[PDB]
Ligand binder design. Structure first.
Ligand SMILES: O=P(O)(O)O[C@H]1[C@H](OP(=O)(O)O)[C@@H](OP(=O)(O)O)[C@H](OP(=O)(O)O)[C@@H](OP(=O)(O)O)[C@H]1OP(=O)(O)O
Length: 151
């Protein structure tokens, strides 16, 4: 519970023909530090045909429970290819300004779950409305088999 949860806005840019995932805020960095707080930090990777193509990262303020910053992840590709991609959100933590892992992770795109795919090929399939949606993120144990050619 509360191990993975991010509210990202799925939208497309029909003016230039490119993706633009606007991550508003997240709610998964629960207080794991004894009498303290966690240090949220995430990055995004897209697996084109099961192969890591483009790699990007975001900036989040440490010592918080809700990773908020509002950043946009752009990826230029045809509107017909946006429905056959696979983007995976990689969440991490900097335990006491050091190093930590085993946080939430999720894959969104072509062969994703209904909750994600039904909004993916819905809002960023053609419109440009920044509709943020939340979803439970699973540990990196599941992502290990997803980044290894899942399509
Ligand atoms: O939690 P953040 O606000 O995203 O900041 C972290 C943090 O830097 P700070 O010590 O200034 O808080 C990391 O430091 P460590 O917890 O690992 O000691 C640092 O990692 P490095 O020191 O290895 O650079 C990382 O930088 P990076 O994302 O390049 O790994 C950086 O994130 P930001 O650079 O986005 O602020």
């Amino acid at each position: 519970e509360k191990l993975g949860d991010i509210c990202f806005s799925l939208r497309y840019v029909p003016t230039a023909g490119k993706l633009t995932v606007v991550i508003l805020e997240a709610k998964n960095l629960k207080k794991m530090d004894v009498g303290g707080l966690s240090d949220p930090y995430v990055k995004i990777h897209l697996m084109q045909n099961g192969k890591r193509l483009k790699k990007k990262k975001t900036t989040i303020k440490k010592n918080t429970l809700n990773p908020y910053y509002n950043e946009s992840f752009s990826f230029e590709v045809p509107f017909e290819q946006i429905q056959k991609v696979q983007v995976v959100v990689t969440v991490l933590d900097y335990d006491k300004i050091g190093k930590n892992d085993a946080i939430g992770k999720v894959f969104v795109g072509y062969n994703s779950t209904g909750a994600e795919l039904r909004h993916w090929s819905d809002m960023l399939a053609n419109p440009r409305r920044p509709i943020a949606q939340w979803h439970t993120l699973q540990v990196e144990e599941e992502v290990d088999a997803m980044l290894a050619v899942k399509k």
